[PDB]
Each structure stands twice: as C-alpha cells, then as structure tokens.
RNA sequence: GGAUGUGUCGUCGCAUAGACAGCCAGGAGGUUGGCUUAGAAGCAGCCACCCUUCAAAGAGUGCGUAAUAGCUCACUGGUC
RNA sequence: GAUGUCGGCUCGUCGCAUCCUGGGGCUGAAGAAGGUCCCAAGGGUUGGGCUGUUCGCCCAUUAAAGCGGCACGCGAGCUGGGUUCAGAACGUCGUGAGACAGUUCGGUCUCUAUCCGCUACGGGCGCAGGAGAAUUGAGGGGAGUUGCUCCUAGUACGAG
C-alpha cells in the first residue's frame, strides 16, 4: 500500500515495462498490458478478492508496490500553489509487467483468481505460466 | 447436412423453376425455393443438392429438404394437431367449423379456421387441428393455444396434452 | 532446426515467422537466423539442458546449447536467442531446474510445500551427460522443513554451484 | 392422508422412538399411529441392544408400515470397539483412535446381507475404506 | 426478462441466440431470462 | 465488458479397430462417507474422496426439501 | 461608447434518464395490492397555509399530483416581494471617517414598432380567351385526458 516515508511528490511520463519479470515467486501470473497509475486501494481490492477465493495457502504475490505521491483540487480556486500530497499513493505500472502470480493452486483454481482481480483493475491483463528463465 | 428423400407413390413433383410445384391426394401444393439451390429426382429417391458449402448455402440447403419432405407426407397423409382444454368449465363447442372455446372469459372465444385448415372436438375439453400444410396447422394451432396459456400455478387453458408445465405453487 | 540465413539484415525473415539467434563457443560465431515455429515447438521440450542438431542452410550439423534467450514484453512471444556450442569434456555450468514428487508429510498436515528456488544451477555439468532434469524429496518435509542444496542428490559427478545451505524447498504453513 | 412416493428411513438408539424430538412430527402429520412401532421395535432388538440399528419403514396405502431391523451403521461399531466418543473434523491433523483387524471379522460376518462385494478379502478392503475417512488406522497388511 | 449489458450462460441450460441484431439468452428455467436489449 | 456474426492464421483434443449431439435402457452396494449441527443423507461449511461388483456406474453436476425424497449428470450397450 | 439581475404572473414549446394513463418480461407473482426491468412522451399532472422565494414542510384531494432544457425561457410583456444606490436603526468591527457573514422600515422600473417573426384582412399580377358558379385534394392545422358505479361475478383464486 503507501510508503513509510519519503520525499512527497512527484511528476508523470511513459514507455514499455523495463523490470517486470515473468515467472519467479510462483507457478502461475498475471500481466499488466497497458499504460496505468495501479492505485494503491486498487490492488487490496485486488488482494483481498484472490484471498476469499483462496481459503488458504496465501501464495499471491503482489510485486507492485505504490512508489509514487499525487494531488489534488483543495476544493477549487488555483491561487497557490502545489497542493494534496495526501490524495493517495499510486504504483506506475507498464505493459508486460508482473502485477500478480499465485502459486500451488489448480489452473483454473487460479484462472479465477485472477479474473475477479482482474475485474478491478483500470487496464487489461492476461495470465501466464512458465518458460521464463533469464535471470536467476 | 442433409440428403435423404423418400417421395412416396402419392406424389407428383415440378422442379418446373423456382416453384417447386407438387400435387398429391390430399390436394396439390406448392413450395418455393431457391434456384441455385440445385435439386430434382435421380432413379427413385429424390434429393436436393447444392454448389458451395459452409453457411449461406448449406442452410437453405438444410431448410429445402426438411421442406419439401413435408409436402411429402404432406398431400401423403395430411397433418392434425391434438389440443388439450383444462380447467374449470374451460370447454369447446363449435359452430359449421368454428372452434368455440369457453374458457372463463366473460364472453365466448370464437375461432375461425382459414382458407385450408379444419376443426374438430371430441369431448369439449380436447381439441383438434387437422390440415393439410404442416405449417399453417401448427401457425394456428398456435393462435387456440394463444386464446389462453397455462397458468404458473395451475397450468390452465390450452395446452400441448404431453406439455409438461411445472406449477410454481404459492400460498 | 534447420536455421539458414544469417545476415545483419531480416527483412526477409522479421516478417516471414523466423526467430534470430547466435550460436557459438570462442572459435566460430557464425551468424544466425532459424526460424519461429520451430525452435518455438523445440526450446519448450530440451530447454537449458538441450542441445541440438544444427545443419544451418548447406549442411554443417553443430551441436550447442540453450545460453539465454529473450523474448518480447507485451507479447509473451521470443525474438532473439543465443546458443552455446555444446563442447565435449566441460561446458560451462548449465541452469537446472528444482522438482518434487510423492506427497508431502506437510501437504495434508495443513500447510504447503514452497519451491523456494525453482530452477538451480550447478558448477561443472559435464558436456554430453548433463541433467535436463532434477527430481528432489519432499515428503519427509513436515510444518517448516526446509531442504538445501547441501541436500539434492546430485547426478553422479554434478557439483553444486549454488551454496549449500540456501533453502531449495520448504513446506509453508497454512494461511 | 398420504401416500408418500419415498421410503421412510432412519437410525434409531437401542428401544425409544417414544419422545417428540425422535420421531413426533416424522409420523404424526402422516395421521397415524405411532405407540405401536415402538413396542415392535424394542422387541425385535432384544436381542442386539445397547446400539444404535439402523431400520427401514415402509408405508402402504392402507396406512400399514412395516419394518427391517438390519445391523449397526460401521461409524458406531468403531466407537464401540475403540471406544471413540465423537468423530473428528481434522482426521488428518490428529487422528482418533486404533484397532485389530479381529474387530473387522465381526463386522463382515454380521452385516454380511448388506455386503454385496466379493468374498472375504473384497469384503474387507470396504470395511477399511469407512475406517479410513474416520479417523483410525489399519494394523498389520500384506508383506512383513 | 433480464437487460443486462454484460450477457452469459448462468446453467447448463441458457441458450445465447441471436434474433434480429440482438444477443439473447433463453434458458429452461426463466429468472435467466437474459438480452443486452 | 458481452457475445457459436463472419474472414485468415496457431494449440491442444478426442476418437471407422465406428466417437459428437440425438434416441431406448442403465446407473451401482458400503454410506444418511466422518466430521458440524435443531437437523442437512453426491449438493449451507471442515476432512477426505478409498473399498466391492462390473460392461458400467464418481463419497460426486445442478435443481429440489425443514433433512427426506424426486428430477439429470460424469462411466456403459445397441441403433445410425 | 451597457448581453437588465433572484422570485412570481402570462404566455408557451422541447427532451426523456415517464409522475398517471397504453403494452409487455421476470417476481420470492395465489387474488386483490405491489416490486422491478423493457417499449412507450398522445394527452394530463389539483386547490389551500408558512416563506421574496426557488426549494421544502404541511391541510385536503388526485390516475398523477415527473424531472429538465429554451440567455437558471419569457421586464421594448406586467410586477418588483428579493438583492449589489442616496435616508434611518440595532448588533457587531473601527480611536475615527466609515464598515458588515448581518438584520430592519423607506425608496420615480422610459406613450410613439423600421427590418425578420407572428395573428388577422385587403390591393396587384399571375394561372394562354372574356366571364358566372360548383368542386378534387397535393399538402397543412386542430383534437388526441381520466375517474367512479353496474353487469358479467360474489365467479376464477383463495384455508378463509
């Protein structure tokens, strides 16, 4: 969710994912692709959907982290200057990127999980598997 | 797909153009086709072939054959629906041809066969379509089975006997 | 895999289903470019752990290795891929992949059995007989047992280059 | 009052069948009898009491019912040899309790006219099945 | 009759057809009653 | 976001030694599986999901009751 | 070198995301009464009390007593209650002159319509002779609402 401490603002920008991975952490993912601002409340709407789908096991991973601090309207005029550092915490999140991957489920135990999460979130996604072995 | 045509004695087809023109006992009857829509009798059978294949041909391919199969057992043996009257004094009279319901409405249902089709009443409570296409029969079968549908608690009014109509059930 | 171009330029080919990689060793690196289906339906199967026959156009069967590849983001779909030519008495080290079987004494105790490192790599394969596999205990693991590298039984001769006590595996709790 | 296109079945402790809670409504809205079942029940098991049996009614038309005294359901003959007071939820975290395959031969030998399996040894194999989504063990077994 | 935008089978029954330009949904049991429009 | 609306490429797949959908018929015995409860017996929820017969027929699709019951499915034969 | 401002009154007209009447699906819809979603704007949508009100609360009804648009429709159409002149008062602020989220009593809203538009009514000419009279209908306008009682039937329905 937010951050413990920082700086406390920020700028905007975009281009194509850089380090979003693909298979580590699990068996099976889910990915972002397209240009977004993840919000924070986005994703435990997103975590607390996979967990009730899951009694147990926990293996969701939410490598997505909120690194980022944006504004907004203190009611309307515009004679100030920069203003609400605390509307909310947004996580940048580019095409191909890795937002989610559950592991230790059935397919479609998963292929569900992830469709509810889905659901809530403002871009579309798809799910993977493996094949993935750059790094290690 | 579809291909068999059994075309009985009866019979008398016409691939003469696109009216498929027929004539049997119960009295000579037409259906139109399409033209591309390649078709006539080979030795004894009969059957409706066709050019391409795949959607807006095979349909209409599958439509013609079902079609004229019916003209078949059409002027052949003539088609009768049997209707079912249910309920309290739900009963049908008639008059010359006329199928008369009585089904609870304040006044009388009267029902009057057109130009090809006939009525008749065993005991005042079934019903009965005879006729000879198979449609109009059942294209008005449909307007008796409309004077009243069955009922979600009771499943009144007209009905298909073998109609299998679930009562919600309330209070 | 019968790769047969191998030029600077793939017009002919970046259209036309074809990946483009590189095989080597340190005394040929000839130029490359096979085609997409095929190391497509092929690299699933051997993996990093499978070296191929590579007749490239003209006829010259070269026997390499799966180095490391990479594929496009946005699309789960490869683009380029580099072989190591498989050697005779070492290699290199190769990346080998960690495996479990027979139920967990963990598994139905309540919790879950957790592949901390999936693939492992391991110092000294040895070219011709390298593992395209790993099959690794896990019943005995129990409410937290956690297994090692000091623990994979190895395949006769393979070293383990990755440090003993890192945790391969270990049985998660529930919740 | 009705005929009842099912079949009455129930288990029923050693001779009751008397209180509201047992039977009651299960045949009083039926509109009939019901003192007389239980003086032909507790009669009939005189012989095996002390356990729950298992009994089958079977109503006609002419508001006659009629009855089976079978054998014990096998979750109670286990309690019984064991000595188990109430079946787990988690037989695979903690287990319940452990028997002989002795106290199985009484089982297939007595509910024998329900078992319909093979001879013996199929017979058997069954009897451990139930055990198994129990709680207990199975002592001994081929080899050793 | 359910005019919902988002159209699916809800049992082993709804039957999605297609009548004039129209995405329908007919299955046995009627509170599945479905049609975008 | 929806969706047997079409056009073109890819994947499993399953299969004349006779599938898919349709049809006649079947469908298991243990067991109302134990656990939990005022009970719940393939179907509110923990645990599992084995035994026996067989050509078969799974502690189980969904609908249903206060549980029952009843209605079909997954597996089996013949017709084509 | 001026696009008059809130609210009423008058006069209307238009959209539909329909308030009531029309037709329909499902209902956990027995019937009666309802809920809800679809299609549907022909027409209709009351009178009082309080407030400058819009709004809203309320009295009595109604099939209903829709929501919005048209320079928050309409002042070369009326009012002028409201508020953004000059008088005066209170509280409040200010040493003061004055001020105000404020409150309160008072306070001249301009006869003459040229162009378009609109409602009525004539003159010219035209319609291949000059005249009397009777017509076709291209097109266009108006109207398009609703209750209650009786009958069927104390039926269907419902344990009642």
């Not at chain 2, 043996?77 to 008059?95: M, Q, S």
């Not at chain 2, 009443?121 to 296409?133: K, Q």
């Not at chain 3, 007989?129 to 000091?150: C, F, S, W, Y």
């Given at each position: 969710?937010?951050?413990?401490?920082?700086?406390?603002?920020?700028?905007?920008?975009?281009?194509?994912?850089?380090?979003?991975?693909?298979?580590?952490?699990?068996?099976?993912?889910?990915?972002?692709?397209?240009?977004?601002?993840?919000?924070?409340?986005?994703?435990?709407?997103?975590?607390?959907?996979?967990?009730?789908?899951?009694?147990?096991?926990?293996?969701?991973?939410?490598?997505?982290?909120?690194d980022?601090?944006?504004?907004?309207?203190?009611?309307?005029?515009?004679?100030?200057?920069?203003?609400?550092?605390?509307?909310?915490?947004?996580?940048?999140?580019?095409?191909?990127?890795?937002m989610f991957?559950?592991?230790?489920?059935?397919?479609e135990?998963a292929?569900?999980?992830?469709?509810?999460?889905?659901?809530?979130?403002?871009?579309?996604?798809?799910?993977?598997?493996?094949?993935?072995?750059?790094?290690? | 797909?579809?291909?068999?045509?059994?075309?009985?004695?009866?019979?008398?087809?016409?691939?003469?153009?696109?009216?498929?023109?027929?004539?049997?006992?119960?009295?000579?009857?037409?259906?139109?086709?399409?033209?591309?829509?390649?078709?006539?009798?080979?030795?004894?059978?009969?059957?409706?072939?066709?050019?391409?294949?795949?959607?807006?041909?095979?349909?209409?391919?599958?439509?013609?054959?079902?079609?004229?199969?019916?003209?078949?057992?059409?002027?052949?043996?003539?088609?009768?629906?049997?209707?079912?009257?249910?309920?309290?004094?739900?009963?049908?009279?008639?008059?010359?041809?006329?199928?008369?319901?009585?089904?609870?409405?304040?006044?009388?249902?009267?029902?009057?066969?057109?130009?090809?089709?006939?009525?008749?009443?065993?005991?005042?409570?079934?019903?009965?379509?005879?006729?000879?296409?198979?449609?109009?029969?059942?294209?008005?079968?449909?307007?008796?089975?409309?004077?009243?549908?069955?009922?979600?608690?009771?499943?009144?009014?007209?009905?298909?006997?073998?109609?299998?109509?679930?009562?919600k059930?309330?209070? | 895999?019968?790769?047969?171009?191998?030029?600077?330029?793939?017009?002919?080919?970046?259209?036309?289903?074809?990946?483009?990689a590189?095989?080597?060793?340190?005394?040929?690196?000839?130029?490359?470019?096979?085609?997409?289906?095929?190391?497509?339906?092929?690299?699933?199967?051997?993996?990093?752990?499978?070296?191929?026959?590579?007749?490239?156009?003209?006829?010259?069967?070269?026997?390499?290795?799966?180095?490391?590849?990479?594929?496009?983001?946005?699309?789960?779909?490869?683009?380029?891929?580099?072989?190591?030519?498989?050697?005779?008495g070492?290699?290199?080290?190769?990346?080998?992949?960690?495996?479990?079987?027979?139920?967990?004494?963990?598994?139905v105790?309540?919790?879950?059995?957790?592949?901390?490192?999936?693939?492992?790599?391991?110092?000294?394969?040895g070219?011709?007989?390298?593992?395209?596999?790993?099959?690794?205990?896990?019943?005995?693991?129990?409410?937290?047992?956690?297994?090692?590298?000091?623990?994979?039984?190895?395949?006769?001769?393979?070293?383990?280059?990755?440090?003993?006590?890192?945790?391969?595996?270990?049985?998660?709790?529930?919740? | 009052?009705?005929?009842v296109?099912?079949?009455?079945?129930?288990?029923?402790?050693?001779?009751?069948?008397?209180?509201?809670?047992?039977?009651?409504?299960?045949?009083?809205?039926?509109?009939?009898?019901?003192?007389e079942?239980?003086?032909?029940?507790?009669?009939?098991?005189?012989?095996?009491?002390?356990a729950?049996?298992?009994?089958e009614?079977?109503?006609?038309?002419?508001?006659?019912?009629?009855?089976?005294?079978?054998?014990?359901?096998?979750?109670?003959?286990?309690?019984?040899?064991?000595?188990?007071?109430?079946?787990?939820?988690?037989?695979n975290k903690?287990?319940?309790?452990?028997?002989?395959?002795?106290?199985?031969?009484?089982?297939?030998?007595?509910?024998?006219?329900?078992?319909?399996?093979?001879?013996?040894?199929?017979?058997?194999?069954t009897?451990?099945?139930?055990?198994?989504?129990?709680?207990?063990?199975?002592?001994?077994?081929?080899?050793? | 009759?359910?005019?919902?935008?988002?159209?699916?089978?809800?049992?082993?029954?709804?039957?999605?057809?297609?009548?004039?330009?129209?995405?329908?949904?007919?299955?046995?049991?009627?509170?599945?009653?479905?049609?975008?429009?």
């Amino acid at each position: 969710k937010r951050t413990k401490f920082r700086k406390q603002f920020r700028g905007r920008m975009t281009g194509d994912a850089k380090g979003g991975d693909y298979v580590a952490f699990g068996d099976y993912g889910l990915i972002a692709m397209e240009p977004a601002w993840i919000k924070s409340n986005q994703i435990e709407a997103c975590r607390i959907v996979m967990s009730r789908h899951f009694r147990r096991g926990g293996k969701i991973y939410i490598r997505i982290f909120p690194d980022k601090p944006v504004t907004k309207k203190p009611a309307e005029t515009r004679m100030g200057k920069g203003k609400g550092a605390v509307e909310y915490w947004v996580s940048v999140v580019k095409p191909g990127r890795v937002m989610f991957e559950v592991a230790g489920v059935t397919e479609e135990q998963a292929k569900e999980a992830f469709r509810l999460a889905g659901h809530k979130l403002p871009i579309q996604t798809k799910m993977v598997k493996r094949e993935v072995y750059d790094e290690a | 797909g579809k291909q068999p045509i059994a075309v009985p004695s009866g019979v008398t087809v016409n691939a003469q153009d696109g009216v498929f023109k027929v004539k049997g006992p119960k009295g000579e009857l037409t259906v139109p086709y399409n033209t591309e829509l390649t078709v006539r009798q080979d030795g004894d059978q009969l059957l409706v072939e066709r050019p391409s294949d795949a959607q807006k041909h095979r349909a209409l391919h599958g439509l013609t054959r079902t079609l004229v199969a019916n003209a078949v057992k059409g002027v052949s043996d003539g088609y009768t629906i049997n209707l079912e009257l249910r309920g309290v004094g739900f009963r049908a009279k008639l008059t010359g041809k006329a199928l008369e319901m009585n089904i609870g409405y304040s006044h009388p249902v009267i029902i009057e066969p057109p130009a090809g089709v006939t009525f008749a009443v065993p005991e005042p409570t079934r019903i009965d379509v005879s006729g000879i296409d198979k449609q109009l029969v059942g294209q008005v079968a449909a307007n008796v089975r409309k004077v009243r549908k069955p009922d979600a608690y009771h499943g009144k009014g007209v009905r298909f006997v073998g109609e299998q109509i679930a009562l919600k059930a309330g209070k | 895999m019968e790769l047969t171009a191998k030029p600077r330029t793939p017009k002919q080919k970046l259209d036309e289903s074809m990946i483009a990689a590189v095989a080597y060793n340190k005394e040929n690196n000839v130029s490359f470019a096979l085609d997409r289906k095929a190391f497509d339906r092929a690299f699933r199967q051997q993996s990093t752990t499978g070296l191929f026959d590579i007749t490239v156009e003209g006829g010259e069967t070269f026997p390499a290795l799966v180095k490391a590849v990479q594929m496009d983001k946005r699309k789960r779909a490869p683009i380029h891929v580099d072989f190591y030519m498989v050697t005779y008495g070492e290699p290199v080290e190769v990346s080998v992949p960690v495996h479990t079987t027979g139920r967990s004494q963990g598994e139905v105790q309540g919790g879950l059995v957790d592949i901390v490192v999936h693939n492992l790599q391991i110092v000294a394969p040895g070219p011709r007989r390298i593992p395209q596999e790993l099959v690794v205990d896990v019943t005995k693991m129990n409410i937290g047992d956690h297994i090692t590298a000091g623990d994979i039984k190895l395949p006769e001769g393979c070293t383990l280059a990755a440090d003993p006590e890192l945790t391969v595996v270990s049985v998660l709790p529930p919740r | 009052m009705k005929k009842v296109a099912g079949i009455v079945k129930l288990q029923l402790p050693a001779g009751k069948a008397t209180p509201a809670p047992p039977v009651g409504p299960a045949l009083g809205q039926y509109g009939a009898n019901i003192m007389e079942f239980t003086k032909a029940f507790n009669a009939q098991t005189a012989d095996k009491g002390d356990a729950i049996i298992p009994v089958e009614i079977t109503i006609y038309a002419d508001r006659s019912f009629t009855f089976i005294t079978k054998t014990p359901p096998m979750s109670y003959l286990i309690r019984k040899a064991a000595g188990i007071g109430k079946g787990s939820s988690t037989p695979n975290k903690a287990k319940v309790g452990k028997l002989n395959w002795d106290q199985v031969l009484e089982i297939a030998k007595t509910k024998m006219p329900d078992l319909n399996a093979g001879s013996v040894e199929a017979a058997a194999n069954t009897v451990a099945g139930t055990a198994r989504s129990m709680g207990v063990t199975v002592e001994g077994g081929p080899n050793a | 009759m359910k005019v919902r935008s988002s159209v699916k089978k809800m049992c082993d029954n709804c039957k999605v057809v297609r009548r004039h330009g129209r995405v329908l949904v007919i299955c046995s049991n009627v509170k599945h009653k479905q049609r975008q429009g």
